[PDB]
Design a binder for this molecule. Structure first.
Ligand code: TCK
Ligand code: TCK
Length: 677
């Protein structure tokens, strides 16, 4: 039917290591966002998408309404106790934002409002609450708020005695701050007034002129993120410096005036470590002896005095730990399962938290107080909605505290499986999939295969209410736990990045091929989705295995990989050399160029595809997907659907901003469901 937009070609040569690549759409990049010929192309593509998808409006409404009708109109957090006050988060119907309340622990009846997001958002274009913490003496409330949606937080202070605000604001912060134990001094992280990278730590006396704030630390390498932490003991505020590879912690005495940063262990390439302090010891999670991490105890900083509590094991990844009165609890991964283990400080007794589900995730929830036997931990599976449990560490009594509520949901209607696929190199790849039992017939069902597979981030199998809209229409939903993710620990990550990145894409194809071969789905109705580094995955897999998929959704996709990674002017590029590599080196240029989706678009048949991007707040800049679609329109040989949807809306932190997310899901699901009919 309709003629799609055709962007002007302006051949722009890029020569590196004597290799000339001609980019015809370089100009779709406009750092200023002025150039009206760029806006015209994004606007023209949006108009083409609106018109191509106009017949799916009814379906988009059915999908939107059934996703909203699953959730409650009310939300009340599980109350927690900190420093002798109980805290709860309250979402009322009609309100755009949460209300934050508290009471003294010995009180039940009355609750005080700490902060009402709705009052805070009045006469502002944007509101997001980045952070909320009462001073140790329970008299002052620090809040980190963003009124501009650029994630530059203002810190302000409220006197709880009379509900009056202090006069100052700390501006361009990360929203990361800590109270000294005097309830009068806060440390906070300033961002670079240009790069907006967190880089300075300041000390602020509450109520005073931010002008008088003392510079405590400045990070020199902008690849080291700067964060603040406070130890369980309350003895130290921690300046946490980390790149993707490498850590360094400085100690601030939280009890005394005029503290200066005390080196813990100075940074050293490929040594990652994080600490706490409790029972007069430092506890250190460190990879110094093994990539899967160990846990050490020390009386002091010096690495030579670190005593092994838990040695690194090749088969068990150590992800994190919480400290309690009588127990260490650790978060681990073994055999493609997340697990929780508890070790008694005195007896050394070991217990495992046991589950009965093939495709679940478990994690340490919020435990702000260490003087208890009660561990709170979270559970979710592809069939069981997200649940908060409280475990008596001594007695093993497990009580449910909260279940995710899902209306119109019958859990026994659904089945899940863990499957292992032998990848082309003999490596075993775990897969989690779920489906509706009564609409299943092998070789018959559409497949939606989801992947990410970068940064060591794991697509852990959990519940999705929205996912029910595909399950109840015959779809088999697949998580492909491909290399580049963290499902099998640090080695799974490292075998999916830099000179191993191709394994990410090979794993996704191998998994899809095996699932079809073994009868999980219809070979003619295989669909895939990924966002961001998941969009890199979508982009590489359709260049390399175009026939495998009927249809693809690629969200805010990283696709112009060589060009972006050659230009430090693009925010994120300086930070990402340890993921993809540095193409200013020919080894990385050649390795990255082989799979860079924009560069490897060729004149061949592609699947149906919906591509999304944003003009404003973005990881991947809008021009990558825009250039990608323009090149695909120019070379692809098929006559299938190719749509670019650019979000022009300015950003929304209210309940309506959650309802926008449901609208996007509905448009994407209606696109795939129309293709599968
Ligand atoms: C999209 C994605 O996963 C990441 C950014 C999100 C980080 C959350 N932990 N980046 S990309 O992979 O999207 C990407 C974007 C820009 C650049 C320069 C490289 C990669
Ligand atoms: C958050 C929001 O979208 C508003 C808030 C309710 C009005 C009270 N001030 N709703 S809206 O319908 O006015 C609206 C405005 C802009 C956009 C982009 C969408 C919806």
């Amino acid at each position: 039917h309709m003629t799609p937009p055709k962007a002007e070609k302006r051949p722009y040569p890029i020569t590196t290591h004597g290799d000339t690549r001609v980019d015809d759409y370089y100009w779709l990049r406009d750092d200023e966002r002025t150039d009206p010929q760029v806006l015209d192309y994004l606007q023209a593509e949006n108009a083409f998408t609106d018109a191509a998808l106009k017949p799916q409006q009814a379906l988009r409404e059915t999908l939107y309404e059934e996703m909203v009708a699953r959730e409650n109109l009310y939300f009340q957090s599980v109350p927690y106790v900190r420093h002798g006050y109980r805290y709860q988060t309250r979402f009322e119907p009609g309100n755009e934002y949460a209300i934050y309340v508290r009471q003294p622990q010995a009180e039940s009846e009355h609750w005080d409002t700490l902060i009402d997001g709705n009052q805070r958002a009045e006469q502002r274009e944007f509101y997001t609450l980045g952070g909320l913490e009462v001073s140790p003496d329970n008299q002052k409330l620090a809040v980190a708020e963003d009124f501009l949606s650029r994630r530059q937080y203002d810190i302000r202070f409220k006197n709880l005695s009379d509900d009056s605000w202090t006069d100052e604001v700390l501006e361009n912060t990360s929203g990361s701050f800590e109270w000294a134990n005097d309830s009068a001094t806060v440390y906070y992280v300033r961002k670079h007034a240009k790069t907006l990278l967190p880089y300075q730590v300041y000390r602020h006396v509450v109520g005073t002129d931010p002008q008088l704030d003392e510079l405590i630390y400045e990070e020199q390498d902008d690849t080291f993120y700067v964060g603040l932490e406070k130890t369980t003991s309350d003895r130290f505020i921690l300046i946490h410096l980390s790149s993707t590879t490498t850590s360094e912690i400085l100690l601030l005495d939280a009890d005394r005036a005029d503290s200066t940063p005390q080196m813990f262990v100075p940074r050293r390439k490929d040594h990652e470590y994080g600490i706490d302090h409790y029972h007069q010891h430092f506890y250190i999670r460190s990879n110094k002896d093994g990539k899967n991490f160990g846990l050490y105890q020390s009386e002091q900083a010096d690495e030579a005095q670190w005593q092994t509590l838990i040695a690194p094991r090749i088969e068990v990844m150590l992800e994190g730990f919480s400290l309690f009165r009588d127990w260490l609890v650790v978060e681990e991964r073994s055999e493609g399962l997340t697990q929780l283990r508890q070790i008694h400080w005195q007896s050394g007794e070991v217990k495992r938290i046991a589950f009965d589900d093939p495709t679940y995730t478990t994690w340490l929830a919020y435990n702000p107080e260490p003087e208890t036997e009660l561990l709170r931990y979270g559970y979710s599976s592809m069939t069981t909605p997200t649940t908060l449990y409280e475990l008596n560490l001594d007695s093993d009594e497990r009580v449910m505290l909260k279940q995710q509520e899902v209306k119109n949901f019958t859990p026994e209607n659904y089945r899940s499986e863990r499957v292992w696929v032998k990848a082309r190199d003999g490596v075993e790849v775990p897969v989690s999939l779920v489906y509706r039992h009564d609409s299943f017939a092998r070789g018959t069902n559409p497949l939606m295969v989801y992947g990410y597979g970068s940064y060591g981030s794991s697509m852990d199998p959990a519940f999705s209410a929205s996912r029910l809209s595909l399950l109840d229409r015959g779809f088999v939903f697949v998580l492909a736990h491909i290399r580049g993710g963290g499902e099998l620990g640090q080695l799974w990550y490292e075998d999916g990045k830099l000179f191993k990145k191709q394994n990410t894409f090979n794993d996704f194809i191998d998994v899809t091929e095996a699932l079809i071969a073994q009868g999980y789905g219809d070979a003619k109705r295989v669909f895939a989705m990924g966002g961001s580094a998941g969009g890199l995955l979508m982009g590489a897999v359709i260049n390399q295995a175009p026939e495998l998929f009927n249809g693809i959704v690629a969200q805010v996709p990283f696709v112009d990989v060589v060009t972006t990674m050659l230009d430090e002017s693009i925010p994120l590029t300086t930070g990402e050399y340890d993921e993809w590599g540095n193409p200013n080196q020919q080894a990385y240029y050649d390795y990255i160029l082989q799979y860079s989706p924009y560069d490897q678009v060729k004149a061949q048949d592609y699947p149906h595809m919906l591509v999304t991007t944003g003009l404003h707040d973005s990881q991947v800049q809008y021009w990558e997907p825009a250039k990608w679609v323009a090149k695909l329109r120019e070379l692809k040989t098929d006559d299938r659907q190719l749509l670019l949807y650019t979000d022009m809306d300015s950003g929304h932190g209210g309940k309506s901003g959650r309802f926008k997310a449901y609208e996007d899901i509905a448009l994407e699901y209606a696109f795939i469901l129309a293709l599968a009919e």
